[PDB]
């Protein structure tokens, strides 16, 4: 019922830089505001409670402040172990409610995707389906568009995308795009194209093949 | 130290009730509230409710009044949450936590009528530079998870294995491996996929086209 807004949803910061995150409540909540960190594949972890009270064991680089309606979590000198999701939670009124979260990701140098296109496995065609696969590996920033073209025409239906979490060693992202067709459709076209549009160029990166 | 123990994963068919467990150790079970929290895939956290084991006092988020029922086995220090008539909207991670400081590791609940189905595994050779990438496509399996490796785990650097996604009621996932041009095809490279729920293991050697 009380709504907490965390804006923006994502922040990019370089290790060593300082950051503050915002949480704004739909109504006044006194000091009943807490902050949680949640890394990938982990449960959340209480960081600050009751607006500014520190939590035993949490690094002193974390601090909180706020007044009734607007709250901030400050991190001076983000460290690599700090990247993850941050949530705020109000406990002024039941139901306790959380903000939608702000993801802190590691800023690094822009990198265009390394792109690889793969025709369907010929063994798969004996199943009556045909999956064309495009890997877009180790790019940055996370935001990317992939477009499939068949004999030069864009194809919307039948694409499945999946994205890796930010790489814990080189800070990049990777993506897989699968275009699944029927065997008959696959065989009655000859040019297959995977087009990746990324901040790194105003020209798409293109990989394509000819079926034979 | 305090531990809150939840099974990693639960599978329920739509309509069938599921009862999630949270076993508490390391402290006096009647001394603190127990909370349940729902988290959907990419989304936020919602409090479902809390129950106090001393007297069974309970406060429920009215959004869940007709969905969740909280109970306790005081003798085994176990807290339970029962989800009635589950639907795809109840597929989510469910955490128990006492005072939002000690947390269980969360149960991934999947609501699905899918049947146990072994994966199809497809080798992805290049069309026909300094390095070459190969792929392995795993389609049409249920339930999660599969374990995918390259050369039985020998070949681990330069690998991207992507989160599984739903292709229908079934799962699909893929993996790329990148190696120097001089290493493949002179050296064998094989995709290995294990699907323990169907007791299936599959090897596909990657062959030039």
């Amino acid at each position: 019922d009380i709504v907490l807004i965390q804006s923006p949803a994502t922040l990019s910061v370089t290790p060593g830089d300082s950051v503050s995150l915002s949480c704004r409540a739909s109504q006044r909540i006194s000091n009943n505001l807490h902050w949680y960190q949640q890394k990938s594949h982990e449960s959340p972890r209480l960081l600050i409670r009751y607006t500014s009270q520190s939590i035993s064991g949490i690094p002193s680089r974390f601090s909180g402040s706020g007044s009734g309606t607007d709250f901030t979590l400050s991190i001076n000198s983000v460290e690599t172990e700090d990247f993850g999701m941050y949530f705020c939670q109000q406990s002024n009124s039941w139901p306790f409610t959380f903000g939608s979260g702000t993801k802190l990701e590691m800023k690094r140098a822009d990198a265009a995707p390394t792109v690889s296109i793969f025709p369907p496995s010929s063994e798969q065609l004996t199943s009556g389906g045909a999956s064309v696969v495009c890997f877009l590996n180790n790019f940055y920033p996370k935001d990317i568009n992939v477009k499939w073209k068949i004999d030069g025409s864009e194809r919307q239906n039948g694409v499945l995308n999946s994205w890796t979490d930010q790489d814990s060693k080189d800070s990049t992202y990777s993506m897989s795009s699968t275009l699944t067709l029927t065997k008959d459709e696959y065989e009655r076209h000859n040019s297959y194209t995977c087009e990746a549009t990324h901040k790194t160029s105003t020209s798409p990166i293109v990989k394509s093949f000819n079926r034979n | 130290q305090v531990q809150l123990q939840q099974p990693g994963a639960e599978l329920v068919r739509p309509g069938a009730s599921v009862k999630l467990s949270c076993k508490a150790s390391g402290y006096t079970f009647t001394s603190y509230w127990m909370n349940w929290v729902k988290q959907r895939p990419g989304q936020g956290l919602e409090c479902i409710g809390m129950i106090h084991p001393s007297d069974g006092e309970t406060r429920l988020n009215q959004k869940f009044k007709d969905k969740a029922t909280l109970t306790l086995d005081k003798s085994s220090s176990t807290a339970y949450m029962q989800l009635s008539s589950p639907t795809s909207e109840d597929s989510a991670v469910y955490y128990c936590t006492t005072h939002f400081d000690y947390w269980g590791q969360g149960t991934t609940l999947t609501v699905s009528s899918a049947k146990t189905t072994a994966p199809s595994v497809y080798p992805l050779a290049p069309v026909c530079g300094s390095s070459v990438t190969l792929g392995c496509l795993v389609k049409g399996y249920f339930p999660e998870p599969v374990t995918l490796t390259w050369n039985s785990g020998s070949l681990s650097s330069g690998v991207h294995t992507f989160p599984a996604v739903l292709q229908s009621d079934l799962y699909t996932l893929s993996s790329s491996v990148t190696v120097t041009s001089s290493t493949w095809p002179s050296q064998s490279i094989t995709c290995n996929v294990a699907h323990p729920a169907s007791s299936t293991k599959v090897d596909k050697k990657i062959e030039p086209r």
Binding site: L46, R49, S56 | H99, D101
Partner: peptide, 12 residues
């Protein structure tokens, strides 16, 4: 007794 966030690990 009212729940206090973090009072299980960190006291009232």
């Amino acid at each position: 007794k009212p729940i206090i966030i973090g009072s299980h690990a960190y006291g009232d």
